[PDB]
Structures are given as C-alpha cells and as structure tokens.
RNA sequence: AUGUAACAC
RNA sequence: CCUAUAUUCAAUUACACAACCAUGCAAGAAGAGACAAGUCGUAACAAGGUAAGCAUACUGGAAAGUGUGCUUGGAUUACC
RNA sequence: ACAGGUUUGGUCCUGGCCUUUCUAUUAAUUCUUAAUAAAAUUACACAUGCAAGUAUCCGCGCCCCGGUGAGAAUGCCCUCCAGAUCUUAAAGAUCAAAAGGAGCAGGUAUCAAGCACACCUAUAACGGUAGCUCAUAACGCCUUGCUCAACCACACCCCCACGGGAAACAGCAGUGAUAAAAAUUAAGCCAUGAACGAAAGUUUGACUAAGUUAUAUUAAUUAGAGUUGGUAAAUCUCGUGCCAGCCACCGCGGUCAUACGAUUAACCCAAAUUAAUAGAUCCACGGCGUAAAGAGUGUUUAAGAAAAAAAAUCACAAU
C-alpha cells in the first residue's frame, strides 16, 4: 500500500460498536412469558434455570437466572442485564437479583 | 447560506404577503383605536390600563381635537398650549397650527392628526412638524385677546459655564501626555460644552422619518 | 528596483545562454560533419553491392 | 446570533463561584445574555476585600474610551465604577445615597441619644 | 474605486477541459492540498467557467483566469486574462522563440 | 514515515522550517521545468524539496507544475495587479533559487517579527476566562484574593444563609 | 470394513 | 383636489393520485449452525488400500464415481 | 502499551478474543456530617400557580433572556454585505440576512449513472447552440446536533402557516403515560443583566440566596463492599458429588474442591465497592511462494514517474 493508495483510501478509522442484546441500554425491564431449564455445551453437563421474557422494547428473549433457588412464575416483572452465559449458547442476558418480583438468594434455614 | 439541496418555500412569502394585505386592509381607525372608557381607565382596543399619574387629567381636561373641533375654520394659525408646559415653565409654550386632518369615524369628531410650528421656551423653530401627543387630555387653547399677551417674550441670557474642569484622573492623563511630549505650559485644560446642550424631556420627539444623509 | 534587478539578471542569463548555445551549435556542426562522413562511407559501401 | 436590534453595551458580567462573585467588565451587545458571547473584555472588578483590605479594579482605558467614542452605552454600576475611578465624574446616585447615609446615620445618632435618656 | 469580487480566486491558472458551449471555456484548475494523515501535498482539481469573447480556446491550453466583480450567472464567475501556453504553439517567454517541447523550432542565436 | 526516497521532507519540522513567505499580492506561482539534462538539476531539486515548504508557509497562494514544454526551466509569478514576474533558472542551484525568490519577493524579517508582534497583542495577560484563550479562570486563583469555595471553605459570617438567618431573626 | 461417549504435569 | 387625502381587489384553474416502499404476522418451502448417544456405509490422512485435487459434463441412498484438459499441495527409492 | 493470558504431544511464525488504565449513567449491597460542581428518560398529553412590564395616556419592549436537540450531513473556516439598532450634521460602532468559496467535513459504490441538472445574444423579450455533474464519488439510502468565550435549528402538527387537523408548559415548579433513568406545585429583586421612564424608581420562575439527591472532588465526625486456581495481591475446615452451582478469558465441579455454599484467615479499595452499558484508547508508513493477499493475458484514457548512463532487430514448435 503505497502513498498514493493510502491517500486514495484515507486513514483507517475504527468501526462503530455493534449493539448488544439489550440494544445499547444497560438494563431492561421484562415480563416473564415462560420458565424452563437448558443444557450446556461440550465440556460440562448441567441443566440451568432460564426464562423466556417479553421485554419493554417489544422483543422476546432468553435469559438466565443466576444463584441457587428462585420463586418465579409467569406474569412476573424482572430486570435483566447484558451479562452473557459462557456455557449456554444463545443466552446473553442475566436477571439481576434483588429487584421487582425476584429477590436475593436465600440462606439455608 | 446556500446549498445544493435548498427547496423553494412559497408559503412563507405568501403568508407575509397576506399579512401585509390584511394589516393594510384592516388598519384600525384612530377613533376606535383611541376611544376611552372613563370609569375603568382601560382601553377597549389595546387592552391597556392608564397610569395613575394621568388619572386626574383625563377627567379634568380635554384633548386637542376636543377643543379644536368647535373652531370655525377648524383651527388654522391658532395657538394651542399644553398644561405640562404651563405647570412646569413660567415661559409660554404654544404651537401655531399649520394643517389638520380629523378622522370621520368618530361620531363626536374628537380624533385626528395635526401639524404645526413649534415654540418652546420662547425660541421659535422655522419648520412645520407633526404634533406628538395630540390624544392626551392635557391641551388648552389661548384666547384671541390673550394671543399677543402670550406671544410677547422677555429674552433672558444664559449664565451656564461654557467650559468645565476635566474629571481629575483624565486631567492627569492630559498633563502626563503633554509633559511626555514636552509642553511646559501649565494652563488648565477645559472641557467645552457648546455641543453639550441637552434639550429637556418634554420636548416632543420627531415622529417623521429622518432622511439619511 | 527588484523588478529592475530581476530584468538585468534575466538579461545576463540570456547572454550566457546565447554564448553557450553558440558553443553547442559549433559542436553540432562537428557532429553533423562526422555523421556526413560516416553516411557517405556507408552509402558508397551499399552502392557497390547492388551493382 | 442575529438579533433584530439592540445596541452596544459596556456592562458587568457575573461569573465566579457560589458566595464568591466576580464581575468581568464586558463591552458586548445589549440583547446577548449576561454570560454570553461578547465583543471585547475590557477589565475586571473584585467585589471582595483581600488580605490587604483592597477592592481591586482593572480598566482598559484606551479601549473603553474607544468604545464610548464609537457609541457604547454604559450601565449604572459601571458608571458608578468610573465615577469612583475619576475617568468620569461622580455619579449622582452615589451622591444621593451618600447623603441618604448621612441623614440616616445622623437620625440614628439622635435616636441613640434619645434612647440613652 | 470599488471593483471587487467575493470569491477568493482573484487570479488562477487552469487547463482547458472542453469548448462545447458558445463563448465559454470549461477549465480545470489544479491546486496543492496537504493530506494531513500522510502530511503530503497532492493535486486537487476543480472545474471553472471562463468567458471567451473571441473564441480563442483550443482544448489543451493553459489559461489565466481573472475574477469578475458582479457575476453574470451562478456558474460563470471568471474570464480569460491571457492564453499562457497555446497547445502545439508554445513560445518561450525568455527568448521569444517558438519551441516544440525540448527542441527549439527556430534557433535563437541566428538573427539573420 | 518509512516510505519515500527522502522520508524526512514529509515531517512537520521540515514543513515548518522552510522560511519563504510571499507578499499579500502574490497569487500564482508556476514552475516550468524539464526532467532531462544536467541544466535543470537545480529546478528538479527545487521541485523535490522546497515547494512543500513554500506552499505550507503560503497556503492561499496557488502553486502549479508544468513539465517538458519549454527547453529552459523558469518560474512565473502572477500578482493581483496583472503583474508577471519571470525568474529564469538555467544553472542556478537550489539554495540560490531560494535566496533569489526570497530577495525578489518575500516578506522582510522586520515585517515578520512585527506581524507576530500584533499577533501577540491579541492575547493580553490581563483577561480572564477559559484556559484555551486566557491564563486564569477564577479571580480566586490569584494569591492575594479570597480562596475558592470548592477548595477552601468560606467563613460563616460571609455566607448568605447565615445572612438570611440573622435578617429573619 | 468398523470399534462412540469422563485423563491429570 | 380653498389644509389634504379616502377606497377597491388578491383568489383559482387542469390532471395524477398507495403506485413506490418500510415495519410486524402467515398457510408453507429451502438452507446453515449446534449436534457428549442411534442407523447406513468408509470418502480423505500411509502409492488410506483405485494417488489426491481444479475447471466442467453426466450419474448415484450417501460420503462420492467416471469422462476431457490442467497442477504436485505424490512417489518412481536416483554409477538402476 | 513496558505488556500479559489463550491455538498445539511439543517448538517457531501469523492471527483474532480477553485482562491490566481513565471517565459517565443505571442496578445491587452499604451509608455520618458539611462545602463546592452538576441535575440528564422522552419534539408523548397536560389539573393548577407564577414566569413582560414600565410610563402623565401616545409610545417603547413582548422565544429579547430562558428551554430542547425533533429535523437536516446538516455543517467548520473565509470573502462580501442589504437591512435593523446606538451615538452624532456628516460619518463611525454592534448584530449581521440573502449570496457564495482557497481549504476542511459520518457511513454506504450491493447507491453508477443523474435527466435538462447548461451557455450565448442584446434586450430583459424573441431566438440559436446541445449542452451540465460524475469512480479525486454526481444523483440516491441510513444515522446524527456540533469543530464549544461559542455556532445551527424549533416555539403542538401538516419542511412553510395563508388555511386545515385543533385548543398546544421542547419557561420555572409539578401531574399522568412511558422509560433502567425520580430536584421545591419554594423566598426575594438585597447584588449583575434585560425592559420602561427625564427621574426617585417598578417588574423579572434570568439571576441571587437556599431546599432535595453519594452523581463527582475536599475535609473529617464514618465502616462497609469486592476478591483469594492462572493472568492478578491474597484461604483453613466442613457440606455437596458433572447435582447444586461459578467464571472477563483459560476453565472448575464425575465422594480428599485453595475455583461451588458456609466458617476461619488473608489481600485490595473505602463512604464507597462490584455488575451491566456506553465512551477514551486500540487495525496498515505492516504485508501478498507455503498462513488473508500478485487479480488468466495484452493495449489504452484519466492519473503519475521520466531523476546518473545506454538501447530497438535476427537459426528453431507464434498465428
Ligand atoms: Mg458473568
Ligand atoms: Mg431491590
Ligand atoms: Mg425501587
Ligand atoms: Mg454557578
Ligand atoms: Mg459405523
Ligand atoms: Mg478416492
Ligand atoms: Mg498401496
Ligand atoms: Mg478410503
Ligand atoms: Mg483413494
Ligand atoms: Mg476400494
Ligand atoms: Mg494422496
Ligand atoms: Mg469436480
Ligand atoms: Mg458410472
Ligand atoms: Mg465404465
Ligand atoms: Mg503428500
Ligand atoms: Mg531420496
Ligand atoms: Mg497474542
Ligand atoms: Mg491448530
Ligand atoms: Mg493444551
Ligand atoms: Mg440511581
Ligand atoms: Mg405600552
Ligand atoms: Mg440553545
Ligand atoms: Mg435524510
Ligand atoms: Mg452575510
Ligand atoms: Mg452597511
Ligand atoms: Mg436528530
Ligand atoms: Mg407539546
Ligand atoms: Mg411549525
Ligand atoms: Mg418543566
Ligand atoms: Mg411522572
Ligand atoms: Mg439520575
Ligand atoms: Mg423516586
Ligand atoms: Mg418519584
Ligand atoms: Mg415569587
Ligand atoms: Mg433586580
Ligand atoms: Mg434594582
Ligand atoms: Mg462517590
Ligand atoms: Mg464437570
Ligand atoms: Mg462468586
Ligand atoms: Mg471436600
Ligand atoms: Mg479466581
Ligand atoms: Mg469459595
Ligand atoms: Mg495485520
Ligand atoms: Mg493463499
Ligand atoms: Mg502471474
Ligand atoms: Mg481466480
Ligand atoms: Zn473560584
């Protein structure tokens, strides 16, 4: 790439960042349409607690519930954030614990 | 500025055209513009309430076209004075009326536009000028036998100083600048006031458009 | 005055150019004479063969 | 930006800090905001006394008289400041509120003398 | 003495693109512009219109252009001042002799 | 710059260290030159080296090249008043061309420091405002004055809420 | 022709 | 029209007109990816058991096979 | 970038992803007081209160301050200024429309042709030429305030506002809807600016002084948060046994877990600590036989380089 070609093509400029599953917003409010369990990939085997939610932006998404134990049924409102789950393909959202219809993890009693 | 994507707006020019046409068509007459309700002291046309310092003079005095409409030749060459100059100055101040056009919309014929020759403080100006504050309830009319009584004047010379001392620190720059260039003369610099004469507030301002020279 | 000095400088370089082109004209006449000798030799060589 | 009218004004612009004001002497347009775009900053005025007990004023004399000569209007505090400077004579508002302080403080002396008895 | 133009191009020099239209030549001015990433000067071309009253433009000339004070139209703001180099007929401004590239057409050291 | 035969001439120091500044009436500067022969060596070095510097110091002046039309290289200056200045180069070297142009039409040295002197009068030290145009922002920052309330808190007796409390009581 | 799915320095 | 001024009008006419798209849903069709496991074969990696591969045509459940040119990203082990 | 982790039984090279650094919003946990700075979900609809008045009547002001970024690649920089205002006999000063251009200016060429985008004449009209922009990016499409003493645009919508939808807070406060996003339906013109008046002076939800908020710095009145496999500072005992679960990447958990949950201990910040999302920064003046890259071949236009010196031309199977 000689000087004439670099003058013709201009300096290299960085591309803008692709928007994530939350469309650039940090959290999103959603209502739970369904809850289920989902299998992981090759290196490890489990069945993690996930949910299918209708978000406030109108798009329906798959989210993962962290922690151990939850009391969630349908028509519950949750707050989700853009953390991705490494084991599960297609899951790019995590419910934040301690907001709306979901609480923190319960200590054993 | 100018760009290659400018689009030909027509409605703004058309709206300015229709607005100018409508104000030229429905320009308000002076009678309906300046008719007054004498109890509320509130203008039916403009919605404005009169100031309280002009409250007494509305009920206690009549305007120029209220005192002029009964004159036989509709007041040409007549002298009309004002309560403002009568109360503040001992010297007579009067206007010699040149030409007057009333408005016909008033059923009592109490409104119009008038011109005249100015005499203020006894000094007579040589040009005709449209009369300001015709509509004020503050005008008075002199009699014919008192016309030459108010016409006669005793000219008094002015005792104001034509030159004053400078403000002190500006005077210090004048002394410093002449000492810098070597002017030995210690004469006191004097600010001259022949262009500083200020005509006071009740002079009527010129409502005619000034020609740019 | 700078226009006048520039005009004088251009005239001086013009005289230098004219003198040097006289030298190269003399050299070009020398090369023309030598090329004429070589052309005459090759023409007289080519004339014998066709005969 | 473009305005319909207005005039050139030499005035005081309030910048600075909370409970620590500062006025910049500013020759600008009349219709612009107080801290908006200006033509020329002439001087400064410190509203607070220093450790030396001085209120400190700076004026750019030639530019101020140039702007007044080409027709810049002045506001009441900057005419007060120029009157204290002596580039202009003393402002009659300073004159009258000075005599008002004389009358008020003399009346306070009389009231204190009556309240002593 | 008010004869001024609002354009920054008071005097420019351009190569003629074409003479298709009547009494006006399309000319192509070349300027040096600093590309700032490379810090290097390059040739930027721009198109202008110039009024030729005598129709003296052959395509390939180098033409001096002077700015008109009040433009006739939005695209013709310049006129020819001089034909600097006629195409194929180039006289040297130093010696006053016609030349063809590198070779002199007539020798300047031969007045007679 | 790694690319290029002479990479040093593409730096900001070389573009800024060339000192030829034309007069304000100068509009067009035209170089006719040849790429053959030992005579045009100085003109070719002039084109290869100094014209970026002159174009940097005169951004509004047009500079134009022409190659192989006239047997002798020359430079031609077109002014505002229709004035045409011809500088003929046939054997002059690059530095002699530089001093020759700077002596025929440049800017005088005294005009240069006076031009930057009325350029330096625009930034007066006594003004206040942003850092990009003025040296100081607060009057607080001056050593003898009141310190700024974001750094040193003010005494209570100066404070407006205490003034309102004492006025209301 | 084939032999899947849990190796750690 | 012996000072000098007053009023009017400013609205239509002739056609095309959801074509063009963008956003959601859908009877359905086709692909790709992921495929801790099932069935069918073993195509390729060793002259992978027919040397592989490219362009292209035909054929076959499927990897694929064959035909005409081209390549070594294959050897022929080198007084054989 | 002073770099580091990560491909493979293993080494070297190429090449992506992530960590380490700084700032801003939201959420979680915690929270003692002050000062300063800032208040930021919405061009969706608004109950109510105020925010333009002054002045001897005429007049003068009435998106001027202030609010917002919806639209437009709008635009930055530079010439020339009609017009408005101020002071004055002139003439100067400020704002500067419209008009342009030396130059700079988001992405996309899977937007490559646009379709009349042009010129003369002498009179402002008849007519005649076949023209104009464009691969150094026209004409299109998408997105967006910005290059910041600041600049541009909007005043419910139909780019405009004659007219029609229809009764307008994108003023200060506040209310619904919506959003992850939560300031007082508050005191004065005491100080500066603006408006008016000859003037004492009047008004000002601009502003000044406060109220609320860990949003950010400072001082102390204050002690909680995160983490302990490697990068990367720091772990002991129990319970579980590819289950529950954790992670930024490599990855760990399959009855002896420094990686899960709890306890002890330790590390690092601190009235803050993490998580998420945006930013700042970060790609090529480096390469093209084997890793991505020399396009199947030749000629030419545009565009360049000609820099010091020479040459074209002979058996054999071009077509
Ligand atoms: Mg995580
Ligand atoms: Mg909570
Ligand atoms: Mg809450
Ligand atoms: Mg402040
Ligand atoms: Mg099998
Ligand atoms: Mg095979
Ligand atoms: Mg075999
Ligand atoms: Mg096989
Ligand atoms: Mg085989
Ligand atoms: Mg077989
Ligand atoms: Mg093989
Ligand atoms: Mg094939
Ligand atoms: Mg077969
Ligand atoms: Mg067969
Ligand atoms: Mg092989
Ligand atoms: Mg061997
Ligand atoms: Mg690496
Ligand atoms: Mg590998
Ligand atoms: Mg490994
Ligand atoms: Mg919050
Ligand atoms: Mg009024
Ligand atoms: Mg604004
Ligand atoms: Mg658009
Ligand atoms: Mg303008
Ligand atoms: Mg003007
Ligand atoms: Mg926008
Ligand atoms: Mg609204
Ligand atoms: Mg509108
Ligand atoms: Mg509000
Ligand atoms: Mg609300
Ligand atoms: Mg907030
Ligand atoms: Mg709240
Ligand atoms: Mg709330
Ligand atoms: Mg109030
Ligand atoms: Mg006030
Ligand atoms: Mg006041
Ligand atoms: Mg904090
Ligand atoms: Mg496992
Ligand atoms: Mg954890
Ligand atoms: Mg254990
Ligand atoms: Mg760890
Ligand atoms: Mg643990
Ligand atoms: Mg690379
Ligand atoms: Mg390759
Ligand atoms: Mg090749
Ligand atoms: Mg190919
Ligand atoms: Zn401060």
TrEMBL record, chain A:
Presence of the UniProt keyword Ribosomal protein in the record: yes
Subcellular location, record wording: Mitochondrion
Positions with a binding annotation for Mg(2+) 1: 98
Domain of life from the UniProt record: Eukaryota
GO cellular component annotations of the record: mitochondrial small ribosomal subunit
Transmembrane segments: none
Keywords linked to the UniProt accession: Metal-binding, Mitochondrion, Ribonucleoprotein, Ribosomal protein, Transit peptide
Gene Ontology MF terms in the entry: structural constituent of ribosome
Major site of localization recorded for this protein: mitochondrion
Binding locations of Mg(2+) 2: 104
One annotated GO biological process: translation
Keyword Metal-binding recorded: yes
Family indicated by similarity: Belongs to the universal ribosomal protein uS12 family.
Protein name: Small ribosomal subunit protein uS12m
Portion of the full sequence shown: 31 to 139 of 139
TrEMBL record, chain B:
Protein's name according to its UniProt entry: Mitochondrial ribosomal protein S34
Species assigned in the record: Sus scrofa
Primary gene name: MRPS34
Superkingdom of the source species: Eukaryota
UniProtKB/TrEMBL annotation, chain D:
Pfam families attached to this UniProt entry: Ribosomal_S16
Protein family per UniProt: Belongs to the bacterial ribosomal protein bS16 family.
Signal peptide from the UniProt entry: none
Keywords: 2Fe-2S, Iron, Iron-sulfur, Metal-binding, Mitochondrion, Ribonucleoprotein, Ribosomal protein, Zinc
UniProt keyword Lyase present: no
Binding residues for [2Fe-2S] cluster: 17
GO biological process: translation
Location relative to the cell: Mitochondrion
Name assigned to this protein: Small ribosomal subunit protein bS16m
Organism from which the protein derives: Sus scrofa
Residues reported in the UniProt entry to bind Zn(2+): 17
A single MF term (Gene Ontology): structural constituent of ribosome
CC per GO annotation: mitochondrial inner membrane; mitochondrial small ribosomal subunit
Location (main, coarse): mitochondrion
UniProtKB/TrEMBL annotation, chain E:
Intracellular or extracellular location(s): Mitochondrion
Transmembrane segments: none
Tree of life domain: Eukaryota
Biological processes, Gene Ontology terms: translation
Keywords per UniProt: Mitochondrion, Ribonucleoprotein, Ribosomal protein, RNA-binding, rRNA-binding
GO cellular component: mitochondrial inner membrane; mitochondrial small ribosomal subunit
Keyword Oxidoreductase attached: no
Pfam families named among the record's database cross-references: Ribosomal_S17
InterPro entries in the record: NA-bd_OB-fold, Ribosomal_uS17, Ribosomal_uS17m_metazoa
GO MF, one example: structural constituent of ribosome
PANTHER family xrefs: 28S RIBOSOMAL PROTEIN S17, MITOCHONDRIAL, SMALL RIBOSOMAL SUBUNIT PROTEIN US17M
Sequence similarity: Belongs to the universal ribosomal protein uS17 family.
Protein name: Small ribosomal subunit protein uS17m
Gene this protein is translated from: MRPS17
């Amino acid at each position: 790439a000689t000087l004439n070609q670099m003058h013709r093509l201009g300096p290299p400029k960085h591309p803008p960042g692709k928007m994530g599953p939350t469309a650039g917003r940090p959290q999103l409010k959603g209502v739970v349409l369904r809850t289920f369990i989902r299998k992981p990939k090759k290196p490890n085997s489990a069945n993690r607690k996930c949910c299918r939610v209708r978000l406030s932006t109108g798009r329906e998404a798959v989210c993962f519930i962290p922690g151990e134990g939850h009391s969630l049924q349908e028509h519950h409102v949750v707050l989700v954030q853009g953390g991705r789950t490494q084991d599960l393909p297609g899951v790019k959202l995590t419910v934040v614990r301690g907001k709306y219809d979901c609480g923190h993890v319960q200590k054993k009693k | 500025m100018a760009r290659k994507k400018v689009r030909p707006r027509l409605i703004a020019e058309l709206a300015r055209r229709v607005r100018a046409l409508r104000e030229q068509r429905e320009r308000p007459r002076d009678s309906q513009r300046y008719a007054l309700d004498y109890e509320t002291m509130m203008r039916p046309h403009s919605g404005n309430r009169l100031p309280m310092r002009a409250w007494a003079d509305v009920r206690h005095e009549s305007r120029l076209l209220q005192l002029l409409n009964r004159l036989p030749l509709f007041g040409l060459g007549r002298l009309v004075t004002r309560k403002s100059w009568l109360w503040q100055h001992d010297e007579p101040c009067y206007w010699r009326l040149t030409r007057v056009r009333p408005d016909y919309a008033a059923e009592n014929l109490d409104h119009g536009k008038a011109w005249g020759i100015l005499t203020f403080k006894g000094k007579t100006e040589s040009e005709a000028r449209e009369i300001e504050q015709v509509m004020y309830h503050d005008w008075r009319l002199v009699p014919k036998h008192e016309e030459e009584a108010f016409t006669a004047f005793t000219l008094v010379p002015e005792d104001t100083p034509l030159s004053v001392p400078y403000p002190p620190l500006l005077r210090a720059m004048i002394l410093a600048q002449r000492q810098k260039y070597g002017d030995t003369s210690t004469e006191e610099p004097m600010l001259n006031l022949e262009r500083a004469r200020i005509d006071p507030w009740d002079y009527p301002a010129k409502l005619e458009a000034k020609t740019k020279t | 005055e700078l226009m006048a000095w520039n005009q004088a400088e251009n005239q001086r370089l013009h005289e230098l150019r004219l003198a040097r082109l006289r030298q190269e004209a003399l050299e070009q006449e020398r090369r023309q004479a030598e090329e004429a000798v070589l052309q005459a030799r090759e023409a007289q060589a080519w004339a014998q063969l066709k005969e | 930006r473009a305005y319909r009218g207005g005039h050139l004004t030499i005035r005081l612009a309030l910048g600075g800090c909370t409970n620590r004001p500062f006025y910049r002497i500013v020759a600008a347009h009349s219709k612009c905001p107080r801290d908006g775009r200006f033509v020329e900053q002439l001087g400064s005025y410190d509203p607070l006394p220093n450790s030396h007990g001085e209120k400190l004023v700076a004026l750019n004399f030639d530019r101020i008289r140039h702007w007044i000569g080409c027709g810049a209007h002045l506001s009441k505090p900057v005419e007060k400041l120029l009157g204290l400077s002596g580039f202009y004579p003393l402002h009659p508002m300073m004159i009258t509120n000075a005599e008002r302080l004389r009358r008020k403080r003399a009346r306070e002396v009389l009231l204190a003398s009556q309240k002593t008895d | 003495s008010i004869a001024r133009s609002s354009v920054h191009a008071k005097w420019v020099v351009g190569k003629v693109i074409g003479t298709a239209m009547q009494k006006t030549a399309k000319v192509r001015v070349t300027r040096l512009v600093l590309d700032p990433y490379l810090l290097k000067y390059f040739n930027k071309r721009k198109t202008y219109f110039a009024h030729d009253a005598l129709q003296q433009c052959t395509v390939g000339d180098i033409v001096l252009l002077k700015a008109l004070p009040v433009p006739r139209t939005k695209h013709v703001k310049h006129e020819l001042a001089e034909i600097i180099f006629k195409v194929g007929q180039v006289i040297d401004p130093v010696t006053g002799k016609p030349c063809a590239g590198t070779t002199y057409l007539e020798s300047p050291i031969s007045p007679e | 710059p790694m690319k290029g035969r002479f990479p040093i001439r593409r730096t900001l120091q070389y573009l800024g260290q060339g000192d030829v500044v034309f007069k304000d009436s100068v509009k067009v500067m035209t170089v006719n030159y040849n790429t053959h022969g030992e005579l045009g060596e100085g003109a070719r070095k002039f084109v290869f080296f100094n014209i970026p510097q002159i174009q940097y110091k005169n951004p509004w002046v047009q500079i134009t090249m022409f190659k192989n039309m006239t047997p002798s290289p020359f430079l031609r200056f077109y002014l505002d008043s229709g004035e045409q200045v011809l500088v003929d180069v046939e054997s002059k070297s690059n530095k002699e061309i530089v001093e020759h142009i700077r002596k025929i039409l440049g800017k005088n040295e005294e005009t240069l420091e006076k031009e930057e002197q009325e350029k330096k009068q625009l930034s007066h030290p006594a003004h206040f405002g942003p850092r990009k145009y003025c040296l100081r922002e607060c009057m607080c920052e001056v050593e003898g004055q009141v310190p700024c309330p974001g750094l040193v808190p003010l005494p209570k007796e100066m404070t407006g809420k205490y003034k309102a409390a004492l006025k209301a009581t």
